[PDB]
Symmetry: D2
Subunit: 518 residues, 4 copies
């Protein structure tokens, strides 16, 4: 039948895999968030309308490049396309805006006085790295400028230097005052403004740099929903981002990007400090060996699933769709497995920023996730998530787990949750139900930030507050009931779970109800 | 710390056994129903009040003996003693009334014109079994009358005949027209009106006899709660009992006594036709071999736990407490293991009917069961009970299972349920929660019949119906708060699960609420 | 199907319970050992021959009563009756001899009524020792006033009489009577929850244990064990002369239950001594202590004996009760390596029927074990060692489950390789081949083990001597009905002679 | 702590995932087979020696292109490079040779706008194709995919001889392009005319396995064995499941075949590309259940055609395939025509070895033992007892003497951690053993000893010599050793727990 329900009845994990049927169609709801980097190929209002229609939940902005005017006009265009669907609130999908910091990046200068010129580094040859600012935009075959000024101090006399996402490889032979005479291990095309990695080195670059201070202030002023904080090495790095944002940026969610060996090693203190994690696989696959990245991924995702906090899988997930209309079989498997592992969000970088087919890659990540959400062995997963803290005195958690148990028993169309801050709907998300969570809120920052969790369909209720509180509760319940009928989540006479509380204000969610859809 | 909660956190059944702790005290709430046979040792109103105080829940009446005049007065005495506590509704316990039928029985006659008198049967001496009615009150060591006139037609030579709870065994040497000549295999003291058993040989007595026809009509007239139907061989035997009760006694719960080889062989059709089972171990120990009774016991209990219908473990549970003030170690192990196996009730026969220590027999069954309930591995048991029917379109089942899950998570004081027919309180009980089920009802039949299920502590609301239904719901909920405070089930500040619905009348249970005790 | 094999295929514990079938007959093999207390009802050679035939494995001697010369003649008659079956070694069953010690005791000094709710002094002064009454009672234990506080409970005469301590002196206590009764002279006293400073062995106990080494007894059932040093004290008494005699600690009280893990790691085995335990702890709590002690011994791989009142009504009656029937079944199902009969076989009117009834109940219960979950939980809980014998043992038990084998043949000298097979609880009977006669007697302590004694000459090649001892076990199991010709069995041997080199697991058809 | 052994002790799948450690180094044993497609970037004897050193186990030949004399020389160079390490039989790695068939195919004729209308004709004198029974197999609403699924076409009206169809996807149409039919029951023959002569060539060239293309049903596999014959009876048939019908009728194909290939490139053209992982995990798990070989394939390290490092998706795909339980992992263009062939082989070696340590063995063996049917075979009982024993002592290896492969294949079914060192005198068995996870095959070149017990011990000691020299264990460590009660196949019954000398 549907939803891989025959696979859900399996006694063993191997039999769950064995009963995975390609002729079993999934339900209409897609639970995992899609984050998209917005760049040259997708920043128009026209394209951003079609990204939302294809299934974009979060707009990421990469502050590695671009000025503050470029990002403000992108933010303006996101909101122009988002509020174009706001006239009917039953069909309005909330879209988050995400800032991704530059962080402690080492980067190259301009090849031949150009941004698009390319020299050809052939294998075994010498190359002089320099810090001399005369050679800043005069980068040649023989010379190379970079921006980390303490680079001669922190490298060894047999260190390896990786340029352009790990593709060019170097080895330090002679160490100079401002210079570093290298020898090319893996050659290839060296272009302009490429990221440099030093995987052996204790790089003494700032936690929150000069550019990052300016960028985070801009995030507060433009009213972003989340910060994707680059190169988080410890818990005091997360606290410094929390303190830089301060009072005005207290509701902005900090997502620590684990990009390096020290972030993997000191993960638990980072996770306890952060609001969520990005498994930032690009920089991680250069810093640690590339064969160890899946171990790091499934650790990070699994511990975030255990701790109940958001996790985003990232980098190169549909990489060939920059140039092609359809992905490779690796790329389809990767998106599937990341959703299977328990990533609350999946991300697109160059596919949506500068790709020739950015709408197809959003659609492809929608179609793969929804199939993989049906492919989850919920029987084992819910039984293992229940055993973590199986006694607690908090009354709201008991209602959250009891709702999820109820949703499996009737195989429900939805779990409708009223929430102010997100927290009641966030509690339902942690137990991983099959049913889509419909989070009803009047707080629009709660609506945008609720995309960070698996399961949650946030709905922004634009209705005025009715004079009686009990009638105001039922109005918000009927709103979600209208949403799922409009989206094809459920029809009339289907069963849904409705979560409410006993009084107004946050923290009082104690009422679970099993209602038919009118 | 308490409740065997350290043992409850074990990942394996073996470590659950290993962490069982004599210093870890149970809660005040005892879940298993104690059924008591009332006879001469416990018939007075004065004694019956002390039986209730010791924790009697069901009064069994053996209709093998006694006339309709005698049993009506026994019924009256149970009801006079129960309604003495009705003055204070907080401390009022409902007591059920049960009718155990005679059934197809074979009895001997009187020894030398006397019920009290006895003869000794020597091993290897003869004993002429007769059917001549001049020897009816004239039995001795040579002559034995019995009341089954088709004994010679269904027994061939060499087949065994057991007398007086299988203690005396005889073997047939030759059979006549209206006689049998036996040889005594096992000797002993032969008395009057003792039960005769013929294992292997099929007995052609009816399922419902003409005496059994009149006794069930008496059950309908005297407003009994349940029938313990004796010697049920098949589903048509249950259908015949259901027909005799008719439309007037349609709400009387039939409990089939599985008591012979054919009732074990055709168990599934009997369970389908009945509202419950008694594992009637006494005559089953004679009919099948005595070493095979535990196999039959654990089958029936497990299948009734699977089907959701009640199961009663019976006969000789504290058999030494007829004479002694404290039981043997085997008897204490038997009462523990029955409650551990999943028997909804436990029973006392001659211990409460005829014994010197009936109040101590009720207390000891109350003490052992309450210890056994804490010793249950609820983690495995509930997980396996969830997996029996994990999809159902009935929303009242989803509410019931979600409440049991919520009760495990907060380690709740109780599961308070408003119910009219019993069904919503019954549905909670089938999943086996640790938390006691306080069923609030204005229906007294529902209050008495709820003692059949494990977990249900039924309370009878005596207040008239408040016109505000929201207030009439909350008055009954606060009445159940007042029972558990006074019973020491919980105190002020503890967490309870409250189960109600969205409209009055039966079948509309849908609301689960996690509330603090005021 | 046979041997509950439909119920063994269940995916859940509940469904295993559901598929238990009374028309599913077991195999001939009965894995659980039967311990029997010998007294006046079962002392003669003709009775003891029929005890062996009905299925007795261990002959228990209660040293609480009877002289040394009485107990020596019991041992003599057991060995007379055992060695009458020696003439065919294929059908020869070895019989263990067990010495159950008296223990340390707290006693009292014409009877008197003790009124419920009254008062009674308990002096330690020997002026008031020779006749006690309703006001004054004497005890022999001098250090009671140290080990008992105010509000402590004191039981007299198997927990019939109960006393609550109201005020404490140096050489006296003054009590309030709770559950009163009739008090006689020289009666047994119990102090619930007290860390009692009595010696591990009494003066009588040192004489009786020394006697056991002289009489060549196989195991010791040491009474009133509270701690590990108490087990080490019994070990010290037996010494080097009786170093191979197995010490089974009887856990009888609150303190032994509390400090169980240190006792178990000191002892060679455990008895759940339920009668004394039922006096000492609340009677409602005895099963909790039963399944704790049985499960932890199953975890550790050491033997555990269920004891006291298991078929109690068979002292006077030819059938047992339904409570008595389920108790013996649930003990075997819990994982008791052995089951005991006390007064049933010592003084009762039906001792041969009771031995047979424990054999019939255990064999049904062994088939009713959920082996699929049980082996899975033992596999998981096993620590990953570097011992070759342990890896071979768990591989053999696994291979017996895969092909549903008729037996596990184990060649052993000490017992230890056959003991390692036993702790993983196979369905298949373990046929332990040995030339050591003490090993054959001590192997009855463990579940699964059917000990066979090879009386054949030692062959020329070591490999052909190994194959003859395998072939002997093939001949036993065919004769006793455990398998037929062409059935599959698991065979454990080693790579060199001497103990601790069992490495080889072979899967062969029976010739 | 090494081999992810802290993660091996976890009581749940979630905690196992939580304890996965980048600082825990694996053992030197790599258990998954690496199948490399040989083409012009990796065809010389010089390069093929370095392919073996990096970690090639099976050389794949795509018979879709290339002549017989080209492929014979390709076969010759594989053996020249393989036998250059044959002087030291302790360090000799056996290398198998695979024949991937072209298969039946629907092509276009000789010499396309979006949303247009073209007509499909079958008159041999507008687009022509060479499958004449196409009108029977497709309906109104069915899809037709031309040129690796680039141009998609939905049929509006179907005639007896013609089809008139609306274009869905755009792009330029050229000559002799391959046509797929999604959902169809295609009556093209199981072996084609060209594939008959390819399969007889493999018997002559002494190949070890056949990767049979486009397998739809059980009778198709039997046609491949009919063509191979008694002269090719020992050559294993691995079915390539390439479409809906192969996925639907999977259980009958697996029964007939010696193995399955998850041929994902052709599958993702045929089925929707989002559903390929479901088909992958179905096919891997059922082959794990049946105990037969499964090969994951197409685009696994695809960017290593051009770049010296893979993508993160490419690294995760190879890891998750080995995690799911694939016996072999394939490289197509990566080794055939790519710029970095040795780097790709190294990367598949490095990823799989980390993934083998990350397998939750505790649940996997518990489940594989639970679903194992109780039969009376001594070999099956010995194998599962050996894997149980190897988990308990944490052994260095499971040494198995095997003639035909079969005893080592039964051990490999139950997925141990420890490398399965298969000792064999049969050279084809040593090559064919690379098809199964765990099996590290070694060819005993020593002559048969007169006393058979000496001949048994010589081969066991040879396995002790390989594992010491390869860094699987050292002297004093504990290993599991499998032997049997007489010579010949089918008699392995004896498990032993031996110290390494």
């Amino acid at each position: 039948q549907t939803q891989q329900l025959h696979a859900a009845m399996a006694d063993t994990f191997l039999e769950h895999m064995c009963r995975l049927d390609i002729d079993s169609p999934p339900i209409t709801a897609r639970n995992t968030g899609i984050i998209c980097t917005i760049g040259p190929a997708s920043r128009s209002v026209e394209t951003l309308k079609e990204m939302i229609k294809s299934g974009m939940n979060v707009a990421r902005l990469n502050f590695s490049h671009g000025t503050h005017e470029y990002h403000a006009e992108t933010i303006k265009n996101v909101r122009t396309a988002t509020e174009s669907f706001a006239s009917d609130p039953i069909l309005y999908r909330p879209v988050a805006v995400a800032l991704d910091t530059k962080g402690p990046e080492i980067r190259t200068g301009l090849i031949k006085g150009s941004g698009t010129a390319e020299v050809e580094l052939k294998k075994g040859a010498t190359l002089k790295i320099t810090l001399d600012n005369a050679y800043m935009e005069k980068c040649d075959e023989n010379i190379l400028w970079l921006d980390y000024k303490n680079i001669c101090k922190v490298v060894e006399v047999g260190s390896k230097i990786y340029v352009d996402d790990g593709l060019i490889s170097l080895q330090v032979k002679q160490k100079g005052a401002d210079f570093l005479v290298t020898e090319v291990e893996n050659g290839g095309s060296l272009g302009s403004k490429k990221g440099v990695n030093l995987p052996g080195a204790a790089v003494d670059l700032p936690a929150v740099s000069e550019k990052d201070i300016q960028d985070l202030k801009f995030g507060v002023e433009q009213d972003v929903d989340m910060v994707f904080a680059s190169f988080i090495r410890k818990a005091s790095d997360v606290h410094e981002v929390r303190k830089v944002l301060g009072e005005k940026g207290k509701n902005i969610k900090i997502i620590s990007k684990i990009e390096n060996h020290e972030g993997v090693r000191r993960f638990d203190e980072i996770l306890e400090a952060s609001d969520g994690i990005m498994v930032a696989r690009g920089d991680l696959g250069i810093e640690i060996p590339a064969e160890k990245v899946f171990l790091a991924q499934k650790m990070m995702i699994g511990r975030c699933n255990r701790a109940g906090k958001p996790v985003i899988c990232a980098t190169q997930m549909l990489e060939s769709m920059i140039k092609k209309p359809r992905p490779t079989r690796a790329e389809g498997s990767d998106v599937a497995n990341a959703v299977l592992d328990g990533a609350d969000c999946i991300m697109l970088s160059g596919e949506t920023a500068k790709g020739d087919y950015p709408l197809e890659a959003v659609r492809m990540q929608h179609l793969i996730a929804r199939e993989a959400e049906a492919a989850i062995y919920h029987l084992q997963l819910f039984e293992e998530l229940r055993r973590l803290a199986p006694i607690t005195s908090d009354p709201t958690e008991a209602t959250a787990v009891g709702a999820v148990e109820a949703s499996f028993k009737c195989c429900s169309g939805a779990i409708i949750v009223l929430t102010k801050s997100g927290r009641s709907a966030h509690q339902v998300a942690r137990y991983r139900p099959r049913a889509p969570i419909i989070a009803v809120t009047r707080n629009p920052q709660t609506a945008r930030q609720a995309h960070l969790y698996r399961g949650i369909f946030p709905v922004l209720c634009k209705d005025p507050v009715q004079e009686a509180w009990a009638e105001d509760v039922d109005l918000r319940v009927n709103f979600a009931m209208n949403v799922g009928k409009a989206r094809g989540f459920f029809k009339k006479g289907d069963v849904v779970i409705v979560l409410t509380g006993w009084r107004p204000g946050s923290g009082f969610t104690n009422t679970m109800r099993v209602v038919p859809v009118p």
